[PDB]
């Protein structure tokens, strides 16, 4: 079984076409690109017939088996596509896939899409049956460290010029959402035929800043930017961002900060960041908080966060925005009365 | 609008006009029949934005011209429920229609006739009159091979081709093909059109087997059919139908002749125990011998043997029993001829003495 | 009659569109260069012009002159599209038609070539309400779309759509209309409508719009109806006051200055209308918290509270923090004790009295 | 087990045994019928834990005693598919059954016969015999009035009352009642029992119009019917049934004799445009006349005027058109005597020619 | 076969009940004066005789002799109601019939006249389990019931019911039985059953009852 990345899929297809192709990952954009490339290559080879089905407990495998067995008078060279469940195949799905792999023909080109398979899922009869005649392409969203490389490559293949500041702004605004970033790049190219994308142009484009980025608010809190954090929180409130998502992100960051603060009384902050595999870009802002808030802070903040989380888990109150603003000022160097923290 | 008619003269045309209608229409107006009284003639029209059916009735009693739209099923039920030989008097009062028959009175809601869609006129290209029998034969021969629901829309219809003095009907769905052809006695220019499933169904239904000739007009994208006082207009599907000639085998080396009834009974018996999910059977053909076998995952096996006229080398070939049974049912003849070359090639089925109708079946991978 | 301002003032040209430059310019450049994609999606808040921009794009695509970003507006195609009678433009309301059977019939029409247009345009609205089978059918259609068809999508909940559907279309997000642009649009609309107006009324309507042009037009229609065919500052001020009901802020201000009579009058006024006492206490607590946050940092107050910005700023500047903290603690205790009070009104009155004249004795 | 039997002699018993078996037995053993060869007879039994059907076929060919369980559907299909006049030889080998006949061979799976459920014995309190025609008439006179799925369990079955020299059948659903009585020619003690609707349907299918008398036995909570070589056993609901006499109007004054044929035709004509949700229509019983007015939510008037034999003061009464139509269909008479006491009270619809049968219909407050 | 004391000793007459003097007096006065309402609701804690009082009222309303506060207990209607197989008394278990479709079907049949009794009584139990749609559907007919139907409601958590339903019926609240009343009733039952007992055992049982006679 060959293993590849999206960039090498085109080269592999140029070298030859294999019987089965597996697309496992959690990145819809890369999976769609790989599927489109494979289908285009198959159509060039003479595959003008395509079929797609969704795998679920209420699945009509009889139709698939009939299609595999049935021939075609003129429209030969069939292509079949399967969409696995998000959870993954079960024993019934395992045996169904084994039976389908048993009924394979040279004129049938099989494609499978789904999430990454675990060791138990990997160790399956159907999976091993295709080991000698299959290629799997891994398609997952890169981390922020590898994000700017991908952004630069995508801009380059579109015949566009991006400045370093513009690349950083694009990565910050569309972290974890490659589809939105690609759409933004396309819109920028449409706006400017010359293709020169300077920092002011993207900054004007960033004026949109639609929603879904509470990490910006959390980073503003970590940087001690009271004005920026308050503004971003207000924009999120206007956008109706799920307060639970903000609470969970700030909870992760605050737990990490509390652990670092407690264990840094005998260790340097940078060593602890290395221990926790923290990203250097984050390490900065985190450090600022760890160098801006005493141990008394990050404890009243923890109390407020825990009370708000319990209230939202039991009461589901919509006043969570005011509590979030209070916690925002608490995370800054503002003394705060400590009475608004219910203490 | 006022008129008076007889139950017998109105029962059949009303049924013909109201037959297509059913279910929940896209618009309420489409669910009603358009009645028009003019110059001693009652016109009943029914359409569904894809096809139109028009019937005409002669009036020999005092009447008033007009136009209206009335419910189809309710009006048909009212007409049918009256005693045989009764006289039905229809009048229009305000937004209501009053129907009187002896001492029976009905009031029905109506809608403006101006809202009834009307198809735009078009110019025909090829006009020809043929007996109803030929059309019925072609339809019954080539209807069962049409696809039900496929992405390729042109396969859902039937290909009608006029060539010289011959009319040919072809149907296929990617796995089986049926072709039939009959002469018409008149020379017409070469032409080909595609008829949808509903149009074929309506054309089959409107035929009654009578001596009245069927007149067919074919235009750029529309087809009209006249039978007596019934007019049926339909649209044509746009596409490029596959060429059936290439489908037929070029040189089938092996031939076989078998009794239709015995072969059909053997196939049915084999299919009784065959796998329901696949409905697949296996045929072993040898010198003057044909063996049919079937099996299911429950390890139950069914086997049958019969004698046929065969002289080729022994062969094993898989098939889908459904297609073979359908072909045998379509061919009502004492003997059937099967021509084939190998186990991975299409098999041609024809009548022993008639070559008008032919079928092509693609073997299953087995 | 006089029609509705929103209905009568649908943007019929790209110039008439208010704001949204980043989308209009991109669409114009794409049309000019011929770079047209198969599937387009529009996202944003209510009343931002997604449907209007989609209709303008559809009109531009199938104009007689050609594919241009500036439709002539005089050819038969433009007139039919404006009237909505264009044959090749199919508008679908996904909310009304959600079942797979309804969508399948509409999607099966792609087989037929366009009748009187270069492209067969499908404009689906509220597409987020489609069923799973409907989404599957749409994905099947969009996998291999004919070259002569285009799909336009508009919704306010893009997250509801499957990732597969999103990945195969170009998405444009629309922003708010600010305040000055809304004011200018309202001024132009009223000038064309021959309806008397005043600058202050327009400014108040724009402020109350809160970035939505449809809301601004609805408020303008309300002012016209209440103003008896005329827009006036007094009419708009009364209209807004009918929707203000600022008894909570008045109560807070009265309590901070220790004015019992005003507090009692405001309590009676609030009790005149149906209000939840616990909700009133929560609102007062939130106002006190916001005042404290503003005192800690001026940036705490945002644009969401622009209506009462001046009063909040004055309270933050004037009142010492200690009084705010004491009042907040007293109101917290009052909220805690409210459930077991003889009545909600009695509990609120007792808590307000305690805040006015009493000071708790903390332990130690 | 081994026995050869003629196909024709085995056709009807197999169908009769398979009748009671349902499509979804929910147990593999239930779906399989019990076949027992003993002495010179073959017994086929089918049960569903509520009813039992037993058929016996005489054997003339050599055979061995045995018992087994075989699928009803597959065996019946195999038996019916064979050509007429064929002789079926059935043998048991291990877990399989050979059904070899002529050139065809089959291998049907079998299950142990010990697992087949059996019904405990019971004592017959009453025994009698009546002609098939009388039982068929009694069941047909009141089958339609049985409740389909009413919450009251006891209303889902028919009440059989043997009294004096007569047998009576009663059915009802809380809104309509049907009663029929027929002499039996033999005095029996007063007794009342309740039979489920499925049992009534099975008994109806059992009857074939033959001259062999039907023998009926009734115990504490069970009923048995014997005819020819067929035996049927069923349980009893064991509940209370409302007395028909109380439901029956007492000395009604109006005795409207209506024209059953035209009466029901007019009722159907009104029902065409009647309220679909409620199926209610207004009967204006006027002097020697009836005006059946039906009005639907569409407000389409369906006033039908007919001539009846009314002689009392004119009265308007609202009735469910479906119930009246069903009663008229069940009557199958010439004149229908609707005996009425008042507008709000129930109407006793009797057959004018025969007073043995009767029905009670409750009105509605429209 | 064997029946517990709770089922065996269900009161069958207005004089056989314990406590709730105000409710009995009000019902007797209403029946005697002829002022009969079309909607009665009973509220209170568990095991206070709401169902028993409702059944007694149903027996009184449909008694053959007439509308009286002292049912004979010997006519056919009384026996049928006591044995729980009376045709015109329809008992609904709202705990399992919360579907609005069931309520609509029940309401569609109100137009039909009663079979035997002079009134058609509906006794809905645990009505607090009905859905909001069921309450809304009921509202209209409950506001205008025909002259030949009556509605009886028994509930233990009246707070859940909407104010609209509450305002459309006469409400009767049952007071929890006192310890002395429970002790006296237990002593009377044991004396009737001829079972030896001691005062302290009765006192302990009454104290552990906690105001519930069923307990
Ligand atoms: N950008 C805009 N320029 C001018 N008028 C606008 C604009 N956006 C909205 N309007 C006004 O608001 C009315 C309704 O706009 P729509 O386009 O229907 O709102 P919307 O964005 O489609 O909201 P949805 O998608 O239906 S929830 C229009 O008829 C205009 O009067
Ligand atoms: N007031 C009472 N007088 C006499 N016995 C009573 C009384 N209340 C309860 N009981 C006894 O307790 C049993 C149950 O009483 P119920 O009629 O169920 O009271 P209840 O309030 O309806 O209980 P719920 O609400 O259904 S839990 C009766 O069968 C009697 O044995
Ligand atoms: Mg819109
Ligand atoms: Mg109770
Ligand atoms: Zn134009
Ligand atoms: Zn009595």
PDB file of N, CA, C and O in Angstrom, chain A residues 28 32 36 39 52 179 183 186-187 189-191 208 210 227 230 234 237-238 322 325-326 329 334 336-337 339-340, chain C residues 22 25-26 29 35 37 140 143 166-173 175 289-290 292-293 296 299-300 302-303 325 328:
ATOM      1  N   UNK A  28     -11.542  18.914   4.450  1.00  0.00           N
ATOM      2  CA  UNK A  28     -12.416  18.808   3.267  1.00  0.00           C
ATOM      3  C   UNK A  28     -11.797  19.365   1.997  1.00  0.00           C
ATOM      4  O   UNK A  28     -12.024  18.814   0.913  1.00  0.00           O
ATOM      5  N   UNK A  32     -11.312  17.161  -1.344  1.00  0.00           N
ATOM      6  CA  UNK A  32     -12.007  17.537  -2.570  1.00  0.00           C
ATOM      7  C   UNK A  32     -11.032  17.721  -3.724  1.00  0.00           C
ATOM      8  O   UNK A  32     -11.314  17.307  -4.853  1.00  0.00           O
ATOM      9  N   UNK A  36     -11.136  15.525  -7.107  1.00  0.00           N
ATOM     10  CA  UNK A  36     -11.267  16.151  -8.417  1.00  0.00           C
ATOM     11  C   UNK A  36     -10.126  15.740  -9.336  1.00  0.00           C
ATOM     12  O   UNK A  36     -10.347  15.441 -10.514  1.00  0.00           O
ATOM     13  N   UNK A  39     -10.666  12.073 -10.398  1.00  0.00           N
ATOM     14  CA  UNK A  39     -11.759  11.948 -11.355  1.00  0.00           C
ATOM     15  C   UNK A  39     -11.373  12.514 -12.715  1.00  0.00           C
ATOM     16  O   UNK A  39     -11.738  11.948 -13.751  1.00  0.00           O
ATOM     17  N   UNK A  52     -21.598   7.445  -6.694  1.00  0.00           N
ATOM     18  CA  UNK A  52     -21.230   7.801  -5.332  1.00  0.00           C
ATOM     19  C   UNK A  52     -22.337   7.375  -4.380  1.00  0.00           C
ATOM     20  O   UNK A  52     -23.523   7.524  -4.688  1.00  0.00           O
ATOM     21  N   UNK A 179     -10.496  26.549   3.647  1.00  0.00           N
ATOM     22  CA  UNK A 179     -11.470  26.925   2.627  1.00  0.00           C
ATOM     23  C   UNK A 179     -11.700  28.431   2.628  1.00  0.00           C
ATOM     24  O   UNK A 179     -11.703  29.075   1.570  1.00  0.00           O
ATOM     25  N   UNK A 183     -10.769  31.072  -0.356  1.00  0.00           N
ATOM     26  CA  UNK A 183     -11.775  31.982  -0.889  1.00  0.00           C
ATOM     27  C   UNK A 183     -11.319  33.431  -0.769  1.00  0.00           C
ATOM     28  O   UNK A 183     -11.540  34.237  -1.680  1.00  0.00           O
ATOM     29  N   UNK A 186      -8.797  34.091  -3.468  1.00  0.00           N
ATOM     30  CA  UNK A 186      -9.470  34.247  -4.753  1.00  0.00           C
ATOM     31  C   UNK A 186     -10.137  35.613  -4.862  1.00  0.00           C
ATOM     32  O   UNK A 186     -10.065  36.269  -5.910  1.00  0.00           O
ATOM     33  N   UNK A 187     -10.791  36.060  -3.789  1.00  0.00           N
ATOM     34  CA  UNK A 187     -11.428  37.373  -3.806  1.00  0.00           C
ATOM     35  C   UNK A 187     -10.395  38.483  -3.952  1.00  0.00           C
ATOM     36  O   UNK A 187     -10.628  39.466  -4.662  1.00  0.00           O
ATOM     37  N   UNK A 189      -7.486  38.207  -5.476  1.00  0.00           N
ATOM     38  CA  UNK A 189      -7.045  38.175  -6.867  1.00  0.00           C
ATOM     39  C   UNK A 189      -8.066  38.845  -7.776  1.00  0.00           C
ATOM     40  O   UNK A 189      -7.700  39.587  -8.696  1.00  0.00           O
ATOM     41  N   UNK A 190      -9.355  38.594  -7.535  1.00  0.00           N
ATOM     42  CA  UNK A 190     -10.393  39.250  -8.326  1.00  0.00           C
ATOM     43  C   UNK A 190     -10.356  40.762  -8.142  1.00  0.00           C
ATOM     44  O   UNK A 190     -10.490  41.518  -9.111  1.00  0.00           O
ATOM     45  N   UNK A 191     -10.176  41.223  -6.902  1.00  0.00           N
ATOM     46  CA  UNK A 191     -10.178  42.658  -6.634  1.00  0.00           C
ATOM     47  C   UNK A 191      -9.030  43.359  -7.348  1.00  0.00           C
ATOM     48  O   UNK A 191      -9.208  44.450  -7.901  1.00  0.00           O
ATOM     49  N   UNK A 208     -13.647  42.739   7.040  1.00  0.00           N
ATOM     50  CA  UNK A 208     -14.777  41.826   7.165  1.00  0.00           C
ATOM     51  C   UNK A 208     -14.728  41.107   8.508  1.00  0.00           C
ATOM     52  O   UNK A 208     -15.586  41.339   9.366  1.00  0.00           O
ATOM     53  N   UNK A 210     -15.421  38.088   9.723  1.00  0.00           N
ATOM     54  CA  UNK A 210     -16.828  37.747   9.912  1.00  0.00           C
ATOM     55  C   UNK A 210     -17.126  37.237  11.316  1.00  0.00           C
ATOM     56  O   UNK A 210     -17.841  37.899  12.072  1.00  0.00           O
ATOM     57  N   UNK A 227      -7.809  47.096  25.473  1.00  0.00           N
ATOM     58  CA  UNK A 227      -8.642  47.708  24.443  1.00  0.00           C
ATOM     59  C   UNK A 227      -8.942  46.718  23.324  1.00  0.00           C
ATOM     60  O   UNK A 227     -10.098  46.556  22.915  1.00  0.00           O
ATOM     61  N   UNK A 230     -11.251  43.850  24.578  1.00  0.00           N
ATOM     62  CA  UNK A 230     -12.622  44.318  24.739  1.00  0.00           C
ATOM     63  C   UNK A 230     -13.294  44.524  23.389  1.00  0.00           C
ATOM     64  O   UNK A 230     -14.457  44.149  23.202  1.00  0.00           O
ATOM     65  N   UNK A 234     -16.539  42.500  22.018  1.00  0.00           N
ATOM     66  CA  UNK A 234     -17.742  43.190  21.563  1.00  0.00           C
ATOM     67  C   UNK A 234     -18.131  42.746  20.158  1.00  0.00           C
ATOM     68  O   UNK A 234     -19.315  42.524  19.873  1.00  0.00           O
ATOM     69  N   UNK A 237     -19.670  39.341  20.387  1.00  0.00           N
ATOM     70  CA  UNK A 237     -21.031  39.437  20.904  1.00  0.00           C
ATOM     71  C   UNK A 237     -21.993  39.903  19.820  1.00  0.00           C
ATOM     72  O   UNK A 237     -23.106  39.379  19.698  1.00  0.00           O
ATOM     73  N   UNK A 238     -21.579  40.889  19.021  1.00  0.00           N
ATOM     74  CA  UNK A 238     -22.406  41.325  17.901  1.00  0.00           C
ATOM     75  C   UNK A 238     -22.605  40.205  16.889  1.00  0.00           C
ATOM     76  O   UNK A 238     -23.686  40.081  16.302  1.00  0.00           O
ATOM     77  N   UNK A 322     -21.539  39.365  29.618  1.00  0.00           N
ATOM     78  CA  UNK A 322     -21.074  40.283  30.653  1.00  0.00           C
ATOM     79  C   UNK A 322     -20.020  39.624  31.534  1.00  0.00           C
ATOM     80  O   UNK A 322     -19.020  40.253  31.904  1.00  0.00           O
ATOM     81  N   UNK A 325     -16.798  39.641  29.648  1.00  0.00           N
ATOM     82  CA  UNK A 325     -16.140  40.946  29.701  1.00  0.00           C
ATOM     83  C   UNK A 325     -15.474  41.172  31.056  1.00  0.00           C
ATOM     84  O   UNK A 325     -14.357  41.706  31.135  1.00  0.00           O
ATOM     85  N   UNK A 326     -16.153  40.782  32.136  1.00  0.00           N
ATOM     86  CA  UNK A 326     -15.545  40.889  33.451  1.00  0.00           C
ATOM     87  C   UNK A 326     -14.285  40.055  33.569  1.00  0.00           C
ATOM     88  O   UNK A 326     -13.266  40.517  34.088  1.00  0.00           O
ATOM     89  N   UNK A 329     -11.428  41.839  31.680  1.00  0.00           N
ATOM     90  CA  UNK A 329     -10.745  42.857  32.475  1.00  0.00           C
ATOM     91  C   UNK A 329      -9.955  42.230  33.616  1.00  0.00           C
ATOM     92  O   UNK A 329      -8.908  42.758  34.009  1.00  0.00           O
ATOM     93  N   UNK A 334      -5.985  45.085  35.351  1.00  0.00           N
ATOM     94  CA  UNK A 334      -6.957  45.850  36.116  1.00  0.00           C
ATOM     95  C   UNK A 334      -7.138  45.211  37.493  1.00  0.00           C
ATOM     96  O   UNK A 334      -7.335  43.991  37.579  1.00  0.00           O
ATOM     97  N   UNK A 336      -9.668  45.283  39.719  1.00  0.00           N
ATOM     98  CA  UNK A 336     -11.001  44.712  39.886  1.00  0.00           C
ATOM     99  C   UNK A 336     -11.351  44.640  41.367  1.00  0.00           C
ATOM    100  O   UNK A 336     -10.478  44.403  42.209  1.00  0.00           O
ATOM    101  N   UNK A 337     -12.626  44.845  41.697  1.00  0.00           N
ATOM    102  CA  UNK A 337     -13.051  44.896  43.089  1.00  0.00           C
ATOM    103  C   UNK A 337     -12.979  43.545  43.785  1.00  0.00           C
ATOM    104  O   UNK A 337     -12.852  43.506  45.013  1.00  0.00           O
ATOM    105  N   UNK A 339     -15.463  41.704  44.045  1.00  0.00           N
ATOM    106  CA  UNK A 339     -16.858  41.425  44.370  1.00  0.00           C
ATOM    107  C   UNK A 339     -17.628  40.992  43.130  1.00  0.00           C
ATOM    108  O   UNK A 339     -18.515  40.141  43.209  1.00  0.00           O
ATOM    109  N   UNK A 340     -17.295  41.568  41.972  1.00  0.00           N
ATOM    110  CA  UNK A 340     -17.889  41.125  40.718  1.00  0.00           C
ATOM    111  C   UNK A 340     -17.452  39.715  40.347  1.00  0.00           C
ATOM    112  O   UNK A 340     -18.052  39.106  39.455  1.00  0.00           O
TER     113      UNK A 340
ATOM    114  N   UNK C  22     -16.082  45.374  -1.348  1.00  0.00           N
ATOM    115  CA  UNK C  22     -15.187  44.241  -1.558  1.00  0.00           C
ATOM    116  C   UNK C  22     -15.844  43.118  -2.349  1.00  0.00           C
ATOM    117  O   UNK C  22     -15.136  42.313  -2.962  1.00  0.00           O
ATOM    118  N   UNK C  25     -16.860  44.948  -6.306  1.00  0.00           N
ATOM    119  CA  UNK C  25     -15.675  45.112  -7.142  1.00  0.00           C
ATOM    120  C   UNK C  25     -15.160  43.766  -7.633  1.00  0.00           C
ATOM    121  O   UNK C  25     -14.790  43.623  -8.806  1.00  0.00           O
ATOM    122  N   UNK C  26     -15.125  42.765  -6.750  1.00  0.00           N
ATOM    123  CA  UNK C  26     -14.662  41.443  -7.154  1.00  0.00           C
ATOM    124  C   UNK C  26     -15.574  40.843  -8.216  1.00  0.00           C
ATOM    125  O   UNK C  26     -15.097  40.266  -9.201  1.00  0.00           O
ATOM    126  N   UNK C  29     -14.954  42.647 -11.543  1.00  0.00           N
ATOM    127  CA  UNK C  29     -13.703  42.214 -12.154  1.00  0.00           C
ATOM    128  C   UNK C  29     -13.835  40.816 -12.744  1.00  0.00           C
ATOM    129  O   UNK C  29     -13.347  40.551 -13.848  1.00  0.00           O
ATOM    130  N   UNK C  35     -13.806  35.395 -15.604  1.00  0.00           N
ATOM    131  CA  UNK C  35     -13.528  34.383 -14.586  1.00  0.00           C
ATOM    132  C   UNK C  35     -14.792  34.185 -13.758  1.00  0.00           C
ATOM    133  O   UNK C  35     -14.997  34.828 -12.728  1.00  0.00           O
ATOM    134  N   UNK C  37     -17.254  31.354 -11.833  1.00  0.00           N
ATOM    135  CA  UNK C  37     -17.242  30.041 -11.208  1.00  0.00           C
ATOM    136  C   UNK C  37     -18.646  29.443 -11.196  1.00  0.00           C
ATOM    137  O   UNK C  37     -19.649  30.127 -11.414  1.00  0.00           O
ATOM    138  N   UNK C 140     -24.639  15.820  -5.736  1.00  0.00           N
ATOM    139  CA  UNK C 140     -24.567  15.033  -6.963  1.00  0.00           C
ATOM    140  C   UNK C 140     -24.662  15.930  -8.189  1.00  0.00           C
ATOM    141  O   UNK C 140     -23.911  15.758  -9.157  1.00  0.00           O
ATOM    142  N   UNK C 143     -21.378  17.972  -8.600  1.00  0.00           N
ATOM    143  CA  UNK C 143     -20.145  17.245  -8.895  1.00  0.00           C
ATOM    144  C   UNK C 143     -19.748  17.407 -10.358  1.00  0.00           C
ATOM    145  O   UNK C 143     -18.577  17.650 -10.672  1.00  0.00           O
ATOM    146  N   UNK C 166     -19.858  23.409   0.849  1.00  0.00           N
ATOM    147  CA  UNK C 166     -19.115  24.658   0.982  1.00  0.00           C
ATOM    148  C   UNK C 166     -17.847  24.641   0.138  1.00  0.00           C
ATOM    149  O   UNK C 166     -17.493  25.648  -0.488  1.00  0.00           O
ATOM    150  N   UNK C 167     -17.148  23.505   0.108  1.00  0.00           N
ATOM    151  CA  UNK C 167     -15.854  23.433  -0.560  1.00  0.00           C
ATOM    152  C   UNK C 167     -15.952  23.618  -2.069  1.00  0.00           C
ATOM    153  O   UNK C 167     -14.942  23.944  -2.703  1.00  0.00           O
ATOM    154  N   UNK C 168     -17.130  23.422  -2.660  1.00  0.00           N
ATOM    155  CA  UNK C 168     -17.295  23.475  -4.108  1.00  0.00           C
ATOM    156  C   UNK C 168     -17.896  24.790  -4.592  1.00  0.00           C
ATOM    157  O   UNK C 168     -18.313  24.876  -5.752  1.00  0.00           O
ATOM    158  N   UNK C 169     -17.954  25.813  -3.740  1.00  0.00           N
ATOM    159  CA  UNK C 169     -18.516  27.101  -4.119  1.00  0.00           C
ATOM    160  C   UNK C 169     -17.664  28.220  -3.538  1.00  0.00           C
ATOM    161  O   UNK C 169     -16.964  28.042  -2.537  1.00  0.00           O
ATOM    162  N   UNK C 170     -17.733  29.382  -4.183  1.00  0.00           N
ATOM    163  CA  UNK C 170     -17.034  30.574  -3.719  1.00  0.00           C
ATOM    164  C   UNK C 170     -17.964  31.385  -2.827  1.00  0.00           C
ATOM    165  O   UNK C 170     -19.067  31.750  -3.244  1.00  0.00           O
ATOM    166  N   UNK C 171     -17.518  31.668  -1.607  1.00  0.00           N
ATOM    167  CA  UNK C 171     -18.347  32.299  -0.588  1.00  0.00           C
ATOM    168  C   UNK C 171     -17.953  33.760  -0.418  1.00  0.00           C
ATOM    169  O   UNK C 171     -16.762  34.083  -0.345  1.00  0.00           O
ATOM    170  N   UNK C 172     -18.956  34.632  -0.358  1.00  0.00           N
ATOM    171  CA  UNK C 172     -18.775  36.048  -0.067  1.00  0.00           C
ATOM    172  C   UNK C 172     -19.552  36.393   1.194  1.00  0.00           C
ATOM    173  O   UNK C 172     -20.743  36.078   1.296  1.00  0.00           O
ATOM    174  N   UNK C 173     -18.885  37.042   2.144  1.00  0.00           N
ATOM    175  CA  UNK C 173     -19.510  37.465   3.389  1.00  0.00           C
ATOM    176  C   UNK C 173     -19.777  38.963   3.337  1.00  0.00           C
ATOM    177  O   UNK C 173     -18.878  39.749   3.021  1.00  0.00           O
ATOM    178  N   UNK C 175     -20.950  42.616   5.066  1.00  0.00           N
ATOM    179  CA  UNK C 175     -20.766  43.340   6.311  1.00  0.00           C
ATOM    180  C   UNK C 175     -21.999  44.194   6.600  1.00  0.00           C
ATOM    181  O   UNK C 175     -23.006  44.141   5.886  1.00  0.00           O
ATOM    182  N   UNK C 289     -22.117  46.274  36.625  1.00  0.00           N
ATOM    183  CA  UNK C 289     -20.879  45.628  36.206  1.00  0.00           C
ATOM    184  C   UNK C 289     -20.248  46.368  35.035  1.00  0.00           C
ATOM    185  O   UNK C 289     -19.029  46.566  35.001  1.00  0.00           O
ATOM    186  N   UNK C 290     -21.062  46.783  34.062  1.00  0.00           N
ATOM    187  CA  UNK C 290     -20.533  47.532  32.928  1.00  0.00           C
ATOM    188  C   UNK C 290     -19.941  48.859  33.380  1.00  0.00           C
ATOM    189  O   UNK C 290     -18.894  49.283  32.879  1.00  0.00           O
ATOM    190  N   UNK C 292     -18.603  49.481  36.298  1.00  0.00           N
ATOM    191  CA  UNK C 292     -17.332  49.173  36.947  1.00  0.00           C
ATOM    192  C   UNK C 292     -16.246  48.873  35.920  1.00  0.00           C
ATOM    193  O   UNK C 292     -15.106  49.335  36.056  1.00  0.00           O
ATOM    194  N   UNK C 293     -16.580  48.099  34.885  1.00  0.00           N
ATOM    195  CA  UNK C 293     -15.598  47.788  33.850  1.00  0.00           C
ATOM    196  C   UNK C 293     -15.147  49.052  33.129  1.00  0.00           C
ATOM    197  O   UNK C 293     -13.957  49.218  32.836  1.00  0.00           O
ATOM    198  N   UNK C 296     -12.738  50.843  35.271  1.00  0.00           N
ATOM    199  CA  UNK C 296     -11.427  50.206  35.204  1.00  0.00           C
ATOM    200  C   UNK C 296     -10.700  50.575  33.917  1.00  0.00           C
ATOM    201  O   UNK C 296      -9.496  50.858  33.935  1.00  0.00           O
ATOM    202  N   UNK C 299     -12.287  51.536  27.514  1.00  0.00           N
ATOM    203  CA  UNK C 299     -12.598  50.734  26.338  1.00  0.00           C
ATOM    204  C   UNK C 299     -13.640  49.656  26.605  1.00  0.00           C
ATOM    205  O   UNK C 299     -14.069  48.989  25.658  1.00  0.00           O
ATOM    206  N   UNK C 300     -14.053  49.465  27.861  1.00  0.00           N
ATOM    207  CA  UNK C 300     -15.032  48.426  28.164  1.00  0.00           C
ATOM    208  C   UNK C 300     -16.343  48.670  27.430  1.00  0.00           C
ATOM    209  O   UNK C 300     -16.944  47.735  26.889  1.00  0.00           O
ATOM    210  N   UNK C 302     -18.708  49.458  24.509  1.00  0.00           N
ATOM    211  CA  UNK C 302     -18.618  49.282  23.080  1.00  0.00           C
ATOM    212  C   UNK C 302     -19.735  49.983  22.330  1.00  0.00           C
ATOM    213  O   UNK C 302     -20.470  50.813  22.868  1.00  0.00           O
ATOM    214  N   UNK C 303     -19.852  49.627  21.050  1.00  0.00           N
ATOM    215  CA  UNK C 303     -20.887  50.187  20.191  1.00  0.00           C
ATOM    216  C   UNK C 303     -22.255  49.559  20.424  1.00  0.00           C
ATOM    217  O   UNK C 303     -23.255  50.101  19.942  1.00  0.00           O
ATOM    218  N   UNK C 325     -19.370  49.163  43.962  1.00  0.00           N
ATOM    219  CA  UNK C 325     -19.150  47.835  44.527  1.00  0.00           C
ATOM    220  C   UNK C 325     -20.178  47.521  45.606  1.00  0.00           C
ATOM    221  O   UNK C 325     -20.721  46.409  45.656  1.00  0.00           O
ATOM    222  N   UNK C 328     -23.517  46.817  43.982  1.00  0.00           N
ATOM    223  CA  UNK C 328     -23.502  45.522  43.311  1.00  0.00           C
ATOM    224  C   UNK C 328     -23.630  44.383  44.313  1.00  0.00           C
ATOM    225  O   UNK C 328     -24.376  43.424  44.084  1.00  0.00           O
TER     226      UNK C 328
END
